[PDB]
């Protein structure tokens, strides 16, 4: 049974509600982004109209197989009337394709739906910047001060360094980096960028980046393993036992493996600055976990919301304790005291 935070009031409107059967009432699905926990339920025997990202659109086609009838794409940054209601999608800078949705009731109540999101300066001019808005539903994943890390530009910088120092010094390392899913491609183009490689990966990968519109993509990607030396593995194979492994399967064309498992927040970003991380090491590998976020710091999200003064706050993470919940409604509070809203 859905619950209540993926219903729309007012419209028959759902969002990232695919895993309940059919919803009563529901005469159209949104989806944010491609992200399993939001998909989940979708397939090529769905039959109810799915409105989505361009982007979206492709990976929902060509990776789930949903028939192209049912696939409603929408164009980013424009008033767009479905079923009757006004809405506009707005870039999350969270994954490729990811978007917020601006829904404008017929009653005069505006609602938006951040999706997953991670909060920027930027969307203060975006369309938000012309109108009030009544409630919004918020990706509160990181919803405490503890959760610290830095810019996503300061973490490439990191990351580039780090691969062009060590592959200048051994010509000889393999670059691997984790995946499990789209988003932070920015980690491994950057890096490929810096080395004047392409990045080798599965075919079932290759596919995958094929429907992100990534300008000039058949330049930085390939399924020729052998001409790459920035490879892309599955997330659960970055590991010592995992990386052995493959470096077997190169047939000695290198000696050394630097890898690179881009994580969420981790606790070693209360003590540890970016400049100073580390990387655990066994014999001729090492593996740095490198803390490239797309989603709202504490600090970001705090500033979002004291932005946009909504009238009512409705979260859409970490709903499923008591704890969190109070701890949570005890920051929004605060906010509101200290903005004056
Ligand atoms: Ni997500």
């Known amino acids: 049974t859905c619950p209540f935070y993926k219903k729309i009031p007012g419209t028959g409107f759902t969002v990232d509600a695919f895993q309940y059967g059919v919803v009563e009432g529901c005469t159209a699905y949104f989806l944010t982004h491609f992200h399993s926990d939001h998909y989940a339920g979708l397939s090529k025997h769905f039959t109810f109209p799915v409105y989505c990202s361009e982007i979206t659109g492709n990976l929902l086609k060509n990776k789930l197989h949903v028939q192209e009838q049912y696939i409603h794409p929408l164009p980013l940054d424009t008033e767009c009337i479905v079923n009757g209601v006004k809405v506009v999608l707005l870039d999350a800078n969270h994954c490729p394709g990811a978007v917020m949705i601006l829904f404008y009731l017929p009653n005069g109540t505006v609602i938006l739906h951040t999706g997953d999101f991670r909060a920027d300066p930027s969307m203060e001019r975006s369309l938000l910047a012309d109108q009030k808005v009544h409630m919004l539903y918020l990706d509160t994943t990181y919803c405490s001060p503890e959760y610290t890390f830095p810019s996503q530009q300061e973490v490439i910088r990191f990351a580039i360094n780090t691969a062009f120092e060590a592959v200048t010094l051994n010509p000889h390392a393999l670059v691997v980096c984790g995946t499990y899913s789209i988003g932070k491609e920015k980690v491994f183009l950057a890096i490929a960028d810096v080395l004047g490689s392409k990045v080798g990966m599965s075919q ?48 000695g064309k290198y000696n050394q493996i630097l890898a690179f498992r881009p994580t969420g927040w981790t606790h070693s970003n209360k003590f540890t600055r970016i400049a100073d991380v580390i990387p655990q090491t066994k014999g001729n590998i090492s593996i740095y976990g490198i803390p490239y976020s797309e989603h709202s710091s504490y600090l970001e999200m705090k500033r ?25 409604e005890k920051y929004f509070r605060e906010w509101k005291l200290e903005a004056g809203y």
């Open 204 to 251: 079932e990968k290759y596919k995958t980046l094929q429907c992100l519109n990534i300008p000039e993509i058949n330049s930085l990607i390939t399924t020729d393993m052998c001409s790459s030396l920035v490879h892309l593995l599955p997330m659960m194979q970055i590991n010592f036992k995992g990386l052995q492994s493959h470096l077997k399967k190169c047939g």
């Open 304 to 328: 979002f919301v004291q932005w946009l003064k909504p009238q009512k706050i409705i979260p859409t993470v970490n709903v499923g304790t008591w704890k969190s919940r109070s701890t949570m």
